[PDB]
């Protein structure tokens, strides 16, 4: 069904999410690719770019500038729906910009074997409200 | 059960989504509130603002500037997982700004009686390609 924030499920998603953040910080491309859905339907809206399909996304990871090592997360919200779906929303700052970063990822577990993956993500920077 | 893009489910979410767009364009606040999850867990990252919880989001709708009437969507991707979860990602332009808009919404059907709702949304503007 759709129990909201079942504790086991919140814990799985937190684990997967913080593993993605490690991959991000270390620019561990293989680890990022393992956790991001890789199909033509995948969409990623990034800070300065738009990517439709896993192939575009992967090609972009190979050439893009890495996240700043000073990246710091703020006000992370992990919300899960039943056992297989979730959203993780966080803000972020770093020394590389005065702007406020926002990141929202939709996570799904499309089969037990596949485990948790990001099926869509949107990242933006805005002036500190 | 998370089959991707079951046609009945894609059709349902497209209908709910285009109704939300009508509500946006007409600034029909009641209709928008009907389709947006209203709990403390709800998150919205807007063009110039960050809102945590249904109450902040509703209070913002009452005072914010409405979407430009000339708003036009581009490259809308509706992706459904099983019968109860979806993402809708679109770009948008208008005469009010030279910037390209991106909007990603996570949708869930939390119960049959509740129907489809936006449980998380992220909207941003960036320079055109």
TrEMBL record, chains A, B:
InterPro entries: AtzH-like, NTF2-like_dom_sf. It comes from the Bacteria. Transmembrane segments: none annotated. It holds the Pfam family AtzH-like. This is Oxalurate catabolism protein HpxZ. It comes from Paraburkholderia xenovorans (strain LB400).
